[PDB]
Amino acid sequence: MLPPGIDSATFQKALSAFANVVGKEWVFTSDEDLKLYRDAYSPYMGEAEERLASAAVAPDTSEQVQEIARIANQYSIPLYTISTGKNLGYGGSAPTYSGSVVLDLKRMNRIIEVNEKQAYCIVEPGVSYFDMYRYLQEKKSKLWLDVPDPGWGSMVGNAMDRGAGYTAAQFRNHFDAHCGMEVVLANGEVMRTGMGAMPKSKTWAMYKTGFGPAIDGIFSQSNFGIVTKMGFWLMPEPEAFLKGHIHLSQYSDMVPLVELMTELENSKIFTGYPDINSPAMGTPSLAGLHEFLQDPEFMALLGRGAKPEEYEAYAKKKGIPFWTCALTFYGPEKVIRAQWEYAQERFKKAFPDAKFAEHEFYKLPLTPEQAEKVEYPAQFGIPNLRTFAIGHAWFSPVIPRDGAEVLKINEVLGTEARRLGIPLIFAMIVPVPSWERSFTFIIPLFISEDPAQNKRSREVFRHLIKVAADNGWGEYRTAPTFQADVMDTYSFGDHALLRFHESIKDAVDPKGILSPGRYGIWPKHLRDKHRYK
Amino acid sequence: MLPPGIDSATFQKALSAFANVVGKEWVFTSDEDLKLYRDAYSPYMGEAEERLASAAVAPDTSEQVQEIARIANQYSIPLYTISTGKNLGYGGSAPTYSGSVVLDLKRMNRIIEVNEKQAYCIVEPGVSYFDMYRYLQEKKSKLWLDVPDPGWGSMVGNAMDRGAGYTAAQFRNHFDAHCGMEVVLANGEVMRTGMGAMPKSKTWAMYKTGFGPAIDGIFSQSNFGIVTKMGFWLMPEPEAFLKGHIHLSQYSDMVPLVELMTELENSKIFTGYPDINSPAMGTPSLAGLHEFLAHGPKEQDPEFMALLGRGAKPEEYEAYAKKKGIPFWTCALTFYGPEKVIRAQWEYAQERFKKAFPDAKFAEHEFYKLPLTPEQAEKVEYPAQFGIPNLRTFAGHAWFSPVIPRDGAEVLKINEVLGTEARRLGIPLIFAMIVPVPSWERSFTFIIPLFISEDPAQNKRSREVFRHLIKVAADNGWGEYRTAPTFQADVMDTYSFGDHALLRFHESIKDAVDPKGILSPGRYGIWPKHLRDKHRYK
Ligand SMILES: Cc1cc2nc3c(=O)[nH]c(=O)nc-3n(C[C@H](O)[C@H](O)[C@H](O)COP(=O)(O)OP(=O)(O)OC[C@H]3O[C@@H](n4cnc5c(N)ncnc54)[C@H](O)[C@@H]3O)c2cc1C
Ligand SMILES: Cc1cc2nc3c(=O)[nH]c(=O)nc-3n(C[C@H](O)[C@H](O)[C@H](O)COP(=O)(O)OP(=O)(O)OC[C@H]3O[C@@H](n4cnc5c(N)ncnc54)[C@H](O)[C@@H]3O)c2cc1C
């Protein structure tokens, strides 16, 4: 394959110049080698519009990255930067623009700094969560990671997509926990953000913004730069871990549950991941047994797509809670037991029929073997593959911390989803509180062996996106298939936001070589052809 | 006055067009009117380089701001946007480029939204901390502000300068607590950031980044747009407040104090402002400020005054301090939460400090069940710790506030290095030591005050000296995070990695978002293309 508008002779010269920088054994051109850069969960799998690489280049150093950018810029070669390329559900290892050369940074896997007393690290993009966890545990570090689940991927690459994990509130937002970056620009120049812009700065990983415009955010969900280094704020290993279960009896309890849980979260009574499920509706939380392990009354309810309210009588008869809220607490035993006691007192005052249980308690540190037995190792910053040890994408619109909105998005998107026949499984989609102050409402897409089905799945998802936007519910992260679809919903001021990103794109990357099309941002030379329809 | 390179007729056409938008009574041109737009604390006070304004326009609405921008862009009129203009120590109400038309947003004082249950607001730039606190207190709100001290100024204006306050760690960084913005660009278009870019978005003040590049940061310490609206995350009023004192006997205790305090902070044992001071050296503290305010001055020990008089070094106060039995260091930890929670947190902090410092002493300094009555609020040690904007410390200046790591060895190295360059020059350093200020988690600010004089010659000396201190700090990897227009180009010059890649990057964005270069020319050392060579730093 060739990059569109790039003749074969120009491409071959570009590739020879890359090989001269990184070595011929680190420039990949074969159909066999490039199959490994296909999106394993492509919603366009096997179709004309499938996103494919023209080639891949795997540099060893930031200096080589600079030289590859220089060469790409000169020859106008489109470059798609990945860190470890494990972005399954959101585009995998494939480019946003078919024909782009993948710049694969997986060899730049150096741990630049770990500071135990100040609880930070600085990492290259190739440092995986597994690499960093092994490094910290072998050093008997008292620092935790915040890891996705499962724990494949890169601290950098995950942060560049604004990914998430499951430890304390201040670390669950990976990009928000970063401090300082190094960026290579389209012209090959290298730039440090924040305090790192001062040579010999002592504070690159300690003070986020630096001096003047705070620019780090423009590189995330973006195509304005190649990130070569990133600092992260790390969570000290707490003294102890307490998970408490709150059980509520009524469907209608959701509205005051959301209000009270959000107040306690905002009051920092707990900093762990709040997990809400419905035992009555059989929805799962982080209980691992679910996949690992059938009342006729329940099965009939589930068969006829019963609404949530229809489970309340059944739940009440079986003595099953309608809602469980699991609160996680990190800190000294006496402290987290007092936080949990306060949480119970507030819930008992609001819900006189509320029941409570201590679900987990650990004094830290754990042994490797005790760690293997915790309900959800990601809550301890342990990257792991257990969750699915006994293809897809998702629409994950963000809603407020409001129970009325939890009900409205179910009522609104559940029906449009039923009309157009996406198989929603439970009575209800229960809101996910990944980050403080909002929820995500998670709808899976399943890849079919039939491209005609995949086409209808893409048309249905694009409808669900427009319906959600009409009710003020917007997506926060998506696969290339839907990136321009979602950016079109952010249309305030006649698409002011996209027109703004296009201005910065043209300033920082005038030749438009960096990850064309990423988050709906096309460089000026491709913008006419790739205007959203 | 005319804006430089603009003729009387063009200026008159622009002024007339502004008055057609905001009305004739809200366009100001007289010397007398414009005197209020001078920097009350100008380090150039009365001198030729003093930052002056050529006119001021005070619009009522964001739609009037759009039309003002359109007109200024049409006539290449340089515009300097202020919210309430209370930026004393950092430029006051004055532009970064003399002859700029001040765009004064003080009339845009609407509280767009307050949500008690989700603990947020959306405000216009004219909403002062005093206005907002009054609004919340009359409503008997269970939400707190994070306020500077003194509490004059604008939630938006202070946030746009990346200012700081004194409540819980997650609100003390005012820009970091913001969620969503509305910006008018140089061409007069309006844009909403984050989730507000979706018309009818329900999440503008709930989910910070929105979708695609997270751009809000580029408008802070910048000249890329005019901020017309901002969301803030607000702190729920906690159940209770507890402040504990840790007393340590030795100078050398600083290094492990910083280590242990930083670990407990990063472990969220406490979330309040940790206050470190030296009773022994008499360094300022929230506690010493309350005393000076309550009982006025106190008769100083002449043994203390002998040490202070001869500019004795910190180590020389240790024997004196152990004689009069006064601590060398006091660390005040502030806890917000349920009484049983904060008492347990303080108990845990005491156990940790007792194991690290077997000689440590402890006291509970302050405890309150919230809410406070108006009478208790009057009598707390430091009202800004309760989100109360106040004027107690009003009963001029600029600063060099370099940022250092949470490292005791750096705290000593910055004292030895700058507490001699300053001694070699004539800058008055009062105490034996500048004690680091933990404004935000994971760093310290090292505060050297510049005192503005009636003597212009002494203000020129002060400028030259501070420009030196900025270069010496830079050579030791200590960078300034905020400064007055006098020093903005000087500080931007220190961030020179990659042959000034950061400034050349900002200049590229400047030219894409403001090609005619009308927004706040020179702010944080960012000059538009047409002025860049003439104003190139030296
Ligand atoms: C079952 C399942 C569960 C998942 N759970 C989670 C979860 O808990 N949390 C979560 O966040 N994700 C989750 N994911 C999504 C995904 O697996 C992770 O986000 C993964 O960590 C991302 O891949 P990566 O770290 O290798 O990043 P990469 O794929 O290397 O990077 C992601 C994207 O960012 C850009 N990028 C990467 N590196 C750079 C760079 N150096 N400079 C500029 N741009 C760059 C590129 O466009 C790239 O495609 C899940 C997926 C599946 C299928
Ligand atoms: C004794 C003393 C103590 C102080 N203590 C503190 C303190 O504790 N914490 C603290 O943070 N500061 C402190 N300051 C500094 C200052 O008083 C405050 O930061 C003050 O709140 C800022 O002024 P303001 O809110 O009116 O902002 P403004 O002056 O309105 O805005 C600040 C700057 O931001 C830009 N700007 C403003 N509005 C906009 C807009 N809408 N769009 C684009 N750009 C805009 C302008 O360049 C403006 O000059 C102190 C000063 C003194 C003298």
Complete DSSP assignment for B377-422: HHHSS-GGGGT----GGG--EEEE-EEE-S-HHHHHHHHHHHHHHH
> B267 in contact with A at a CB cutoff of 8 Å?
yes
Residues A75 and A10: beta-carbon distance below 8 Å: yes
Optimal mutation site among A143, A172, A241, A268, interface B, most CBs of chain B within 10 A: A268
Q: Which residues in B lie closer than 8 A to residue A203 (C-beta atoms)? A: 403-405, 443, 477-479
Q: With CB atoms and an 8 Å threshold, state whether B403 touches A195.
A: yes
CB atoms closer than 10 angstroms to residue A419: 11
Optimal mutation site among B65, B90, B96, B117, interface A, most CBs of chain A within 10 A: B117
Helix axes B497-513, A492-508, angle to 10 degrees: 150
Tell me the backbone φ, ψ of residue B317, rounded to 5 degrees: -85, -10
Residues B122 and B212 both lie in one domain: yes
> Among candidates B526, B258, B531, B524, which has minimal Cα distance to B413?
B258
Cα–ligand 2 centroid distance for B88 (angstroms): 7
CB atoms closer than 10 angstroms to residue B502: 25
What is the amino acid identity at position A327? Answer: L
> B369 in contact with A at a CB cutoff of 8 Å?
no
- State both tokens at A455: 């086409």
Q: Is the CB of B90 under 6 A from ligand 2?
A: yes
Rounded Cα distance, A515 and A518, in Å: 6
> A446 in contact with B at a CB cutoff of 8 Å?
no
What residues contact A13, with CB distance under 8 A and at least 6 apart?
A75
Alpha helices, DSSP H only, in A267-383?
289-292, 296-303, 312-318, 333-350, 368-371
Please state, in angstroms and as integers, the Cα–Cα distance from residue A385 to each residue in A225, B69, B224, following that order: 31, 55, 45
Among A400, A476, A499, the residue with its CB nearest the CB of B211 is A476
Residues A347 and A407 both lie in one domain: no
Residues 34-93 of chain B with CB under 8 A from chain A are: none
Catalytic, out of A41, A75, A80, A90? A90
Q: With CB atoms and an 8 Å threshold, state whether B491 touches A196.
A: no
Helix axes A480-489, A451-470, angle to 10 degrees: 20
Domain boundary among B346, B370, B394: B370
> Residue A262: exposed, middle, or buried by beta-carbon count in 10 A (0-12, 13-18, 19+)?
buried
The per-residue b/e assignment along A318-353, b for 16 or more CB within 10 angstroms, e otherwise, is eebbbbbbbbbbbbbbbbbbbbbebbeebbeeebee
Q: Say which residue the tokens 């600083």 belong to.
A: B254
DSSP state of B497: H
**Which residues' Cβ are closer than 6 Å to ligand 1?**
A 81-91, 105, 125, 148-150, 153-154, 156-158, 160-161, 163-164, 226-227, 515, 518
Residue A118 domain flag: yes
Q: Is the CB of B98 under 6 A from ligand 2?
A: no
Residue A502 domain flag: no
Residues A249 and A350 both lie in one domain: yes
Q: Which residues in B lie closer than 8 A to residue A118 (C-beta atoms)? A: 262, 266, 405-407, 442
Technique behind this structure?
X-ray
Rounded Cα distance, B151 and B393, in Å: 10
Please state, in angstroms and as integers, the Cα–Cα distance from residue A429 to each residue in A56, A277, A410, following that order: 40, 10, 6
Residues A321 and A404 both lie in one domain: no
Residues A274 and A287 both lie in one domain: yes
Residues B315 and B406 both lie in one domain: no
Q: Which H helix or E strand runs over B509? A: helix B497-513
Domain boundary among B316, B348, B370: B370
- Chain A: nearest CA to B450, how far in angstroms? 20
> Among candidates A455, A63, A363, A338, which has minimal Cα distance to B239?
A338
What residues contact A533, with CB distance under 8 A and at least 6 apart?
none
CA A356 from centroid of its chain's CA atoms: 32
> Among candidates B259, B260, B247, B269, which has minimal Cα distance to B168?
B269
Reduced to 3 DSSP states, what percent helix, strand and coil does chain A have, rounded to the nearest 5?
A: 40, 20, 45
Q: With CB atoms and an 8 Å threshold, state whether A508 touches B509.
A: yes
What residues contact B16, with CB distance under 8 A and at least 6 apart?
none
- Chain B: nearest CA to A127, how far in angstroms? 23
> Residue A515: exposed, middle, or buried by beta-carbon count in 10 A (0-12, 13-18, 19+)?
buried
Residues B121 and B231 both lie in one domain: yes
CB atoms closer than 10 angstroms to residue A473: 28
Residue B142 domain flag: yes
Among B211, B494, B503, the residue with its CB nearest the CB of A487 is B211
Nearest CA in chain A to B239: A267
Residues B176 and B225 both lie in one domain: yes
Q: Which residues in B lie closer than 8 A to residue A514 (C-beta atoms)? A: none
Please state, in angstroms and as integers, the Cα–Cα distance from residue A1 to each residue in A4, A53, A487, B9, B446, following that order: 9, 8, 28, 61, 58
Atom 22 in ligand 2: which residue has the minimum CA distance? B87
What secondary structure, in 3-state letters, does B221-234 show?
A: CCCCCEEEEEEEEC
Q: Where are the beta strands (DSSP E) in A16-59?
A: 27-28, 55-57
DSSP state of A213: S
Q: With CB atoms and an 8 Å threshold, state whether B410 touches A202.
A: yes
Please state, in angstroms and as integers, the Cα–Cα distance from residue A231 to each residue in A52, A141, A234, B215, following that order: 31, 17, 10, 19
| Nearest atom, ligand 2, residue B87 CA | 23
> Among candidates A212, A224, A43, which has minimal Cα distance to B217?
A212
Number of domains in chain B: 3
- In terms of DSSP bridges, do strands B402-404 and B479-480 run parallel, antiparallel, or are they unpaired? antiparallel
CB atoms closer than 10 angstroms to residue A187: 15
Testing ligand 2's pocket by substitution, the residue of B83, B226, B481 carrying the most ligand atoms inside 8 A of its CB is: B83
> A529 in contact with B at a CB cutoff of 8 Å?
no
Nearest CA in chain A to B477: A201
CA dihedral A66, A72, A78, A79 (to 10 degrees): -30
Residues B230 and B115 both lie in one domain: yes
Rounded Cα distance, A132 and A141, in Å: 11
Q: With CB atoms and an 8 Å threshold, state whether B199 touches A492.
A: yes
Closest ligand by atom to B154 CA: 2
Reduced to 3 DSSP states, what percent helix, strand and coil does chain B have, rounded to the nearest 5?
A: 40, 20, 40
Resolution in A: 1.8
Nearest CA in chain A to B162: A209
> Among candidates B121, B157, B167, B152, which has minimal Cα distance to B389?
B152
Beta bridge partners of B247: B330, B361
> Among candidates B471, B440, B144, which has minimal Cα distance to B274?
B440
Q: Which residues in A lie closer than 8 A to residue B511 (C-beta atoms)? A: 507
Optimal mutation site among B191, B224, B268, B339, interface A, most CBs of chain A within 10 A: B268
CA end-to-end span of chain B: 27
Residues A133 and A165: beta-carbon distance below 8 Å: no
What residues contact A8, with CB distance under 8 A and at least 6 apart?
A2
Cis amide prior to B302 (ω within 30 degrees): no
Testing ligand 2's pocket by substitution, the residue of B64, B88, B221, B488 carrying the most ligand atoms inside 8 A of its CB is: B88
CA B330 from centroid of its chain's CA atoms: 25
R_g of chain A computed on alpha carbons: 24
Q: What angle do CA B431, B352, B361 make, to 5 degrees?
A: 50
- Chain B: nearest CA to A302, how far in angstroms? 31
- State both tokens at A262: 């959000």
Residues A48 and A98: beta-carbon distance below 8 Å: no
Tell me the backbone φ, ψ of residue B67, rounded to 5 degrees: -70, -40
> B20 in contact with A at a CB cutoff of 8 Å?
no
Residues B366 and B277 both lie in one domain: yes
> Among candidates A475, A476, A491, A480, which has minimal Cα distance to A517?
A480
SS3 label, residue B119: coil
Residue B515 domain flag: no
What residues contact A367, with CB distance under 8 A and at least 6 apart?
none
Residues A269 and A178 both lie in one domain: no
Q: Say which residue the tokens 């009057």 belong to.
A: B378
Residue A523 domain flag: no
Q: Say which residue the tokens 């005319």 belong to.
A: B2
Rounded Cα distance, B330 and B307, in Å: 20
- State both tokens at A443: 């709808």
| Nearest atom, ligand 2, residue B523 CA | 47
CA torsion through residues B51, B53, B58, B59, sign = negative
What secondary structure, in 3-state letters, does B457-491 show?
A: HHHHHHHHHHHHHHHHHHHCCCEECCCCHHHHHHH
- In terms of DSSP bridges, do strands B100-104 and B79-82 run parallel, antiparallel, or are they unpaired? parallel
Please state, in angstroms and as integers, the Cα–Cα distance from residue B78 to each residue in B4, B13, B33, B57, following that order: 9, 14, 19, 12
What residues contact B117, with CB distance under 8 A and at least 6 apart?
A259, A262, A263, A401, A402
CB atoms closer than 10 angstroms to residue B60: 17
What residues contact A92, with CB distance under 8 A and at least 6 apart?
A38, A39, A40, A41, A42, A85, A86
Q: With CB atoms and an 8 Å threshold, state whether B203 touches A118.
A: no
Residues A287 and A189 both lie in one domain: no
Domain boundary among A183, A206, A236: A236
CB atoms closer than 10 angstroms to residue B511: 16
Cα–ligand 2 centroid distance for B96 (angstroms): 14
> Among candidates B260, B404, B415, B410, which has minimal Cα distance to A204?
B404
CA dihedral A46, A50, A54, A60 (to 10 degrees): -100
DSSP A402-459: -HHHHHHHHHHHHHHHHHHT----SSSPPPB-SSTT-EE--EEEE--S-HHHHHHHHH
Residues 209-248 of chain A with CB under 8 A from chain B are: 209-222, 224, 233, 235-236, 238-239
Rounded Cα distance, A163 and A89, in Å: 12
Q: What is the CATH number of the domain that holds B290?
A: 3.40.462.10
SS3 label, residue A142: coil
Residue B89 domain flag: no
Q: Is the CB of B389 under 6 A from ligand 2?
A: no
Rounded Cα distance, B206 and A398, in Å: 9
Residue A483 domain flag: no
> Among candidates A94, A120, A124, which has minimal Cα distance to A109?
A124
CA torsion through residues A88, A93, A97, A103, sign = positive
Atom 13 in ligand 1: which residue has the minimum CA distance? A148
CA dihedral B152, B156, B158, B164 (to 10 degrees): 100
- Chain B: nearest CA to A436, how far in angstroms? 8
- In terms of DSSP bridges, do strands B100-104 and B53-57 run parallel, antiparallel, or are they unpaired? parallel
Rounded Cα distance, A205 and A182, in Å: 11
Optimal mutation site among B116, B267, B506, interface A, most CBs of chain A within 10 A: B267
Residues 376-435 of chain A with CB under 8 A from chain B are: 398-402, 405, 435
Q: Which H helix or E strand runs over A323? A: strand A323-331
| Nearest atom, ligand 2, residue B164 CA | 11
Q: What is the CATH number of the domain that holds B189?
A: 3.30.465.10
Residue A347 domain flag: yes
DSSP B268-290: TS--SPPEEE-TTTT---HHHHH
Nearest CA in chain B to A396: B211
- State both tokens at B17: 């067009």
> Residue A357: exposed, middle, or buried by beta-carbon count in 10 A (0-12, 13-18, 19+)?
exposed
Cα–ligand 2 centroid distance for B230 (angstroms): 15
Residues A59 and A105: beta-carbon distance below 8 Å: yes
Size of interface A-B (CB pairs under 8 A): 344
The set of long-range contacts for B382-385, using a CB threshold of 8 Å and a minimum separation of 24, is: B382/B149, B382/B166, B382/B286, B382/B289, B382/B290, B383/B149, B384/B147, B384/B148, B384/B149, B384/B151, B384/B165, B384/B166, B384/B167, B385/B166, B385/B167, B385/B241, B385/B272, B385/B273, B385/B286, B385/B334
Tell me the backbone φ, ψ of residue B333, rounded to 5 degrees: -100, 130
CB atoms closer than 10 angstroms to residue B497: 20
The per-residue b/e assignment along B302-339, b for 16 or more CB within 10 angstroms, e otherwise, is eebeebbeeeeebeebbebbeeeebbbbbbbbbbbbbb
SS3 label, residue A237: coil
Cα–ligand 1 centroid distance for A282 (angstroms): 30
SS3 label, residue B314: helix
Containing domain of residue A453, as a range?
Answer: 397-475
